[PDB]
Amino acid sequence: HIKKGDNVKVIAGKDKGKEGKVIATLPKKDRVVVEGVNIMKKHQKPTQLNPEGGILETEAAIHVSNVQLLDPKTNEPTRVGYKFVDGKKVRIAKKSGEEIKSN
Amino acid sequence: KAKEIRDLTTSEIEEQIKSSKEELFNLRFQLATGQLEETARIRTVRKTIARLKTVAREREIEQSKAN
């Protein structure tokens, strides 16, 4: 269960083994978007505040299950557990200790 | 907003209602006469009248229950 600022690794796709930071997450259809990965090519006609433009190479969404968090000790991809520390709920790395990502 | 609407008097609640109902009328009136462009003020003033009428109903509930 990856959050909005996390450094992740992709398992499946065109790009696999690739790093990148998630920038939006789309929860109710669980498709995150990772920078550099799934670069689409739109065909936009000219808009009210835009030029015509050819292809618009922006990032598409990746499924959440294709994306995995890394270990802050090993830099292996890892699953995520949960610990109760002073009432809050933090994210265990399941191979090592704490992963720290406010932003 | 239900923490300072409780702090009002039940005689300032009935004035803050008709203050907000004049406000809700003005930016519903200049929504038709089309110079508004900030239309989220309409919903937040409709809910404020609903906060102001929920606490000014449960005053009268408590005022009738302990009586």
């Binding site: - | 109902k21 009328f25 519903r28 009136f29 929504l31 038709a32 006469t33």
Partner: protein
């Protein structure tokens, strides 16, 4: 009351030509009479009203998205204030 029973102004090219005279057109609530439209417009705008004219319009059939239905019924008042004016932009 008294601002629940005026909903909107009516700004058309039939209505702006009546504002060349002292006549102002309002889309009032459907449950009201023209006496309390008069007693409401001189409470909001502080004018003095000579006459007022009501008419009901029926629901107008519209099809948006190729599914059929109706518009709301609406009640239109035309107030005819003696002196003063209603400031509009």
């Amino acid at each position: 009351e008294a601002r629940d029973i005026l909903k909107r102004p009516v700004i058309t090219e039939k209505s702006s030509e009546a504002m060349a005279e002292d006549k102002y057109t309002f889309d009032v609530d459907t449950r009201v009479n023209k006496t309390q439209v008069k007693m409401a417009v001189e409470e909001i705008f502080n004018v003095k009203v000579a006459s007022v004219n009501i008419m009901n319009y029926k629901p107008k059939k519209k099809r948006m998205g190729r599914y059929q239905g109706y518009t709301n019924k609406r009640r239109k008042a035309i107030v005819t204030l003696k002196e003063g004016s209603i400031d509009l932009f």
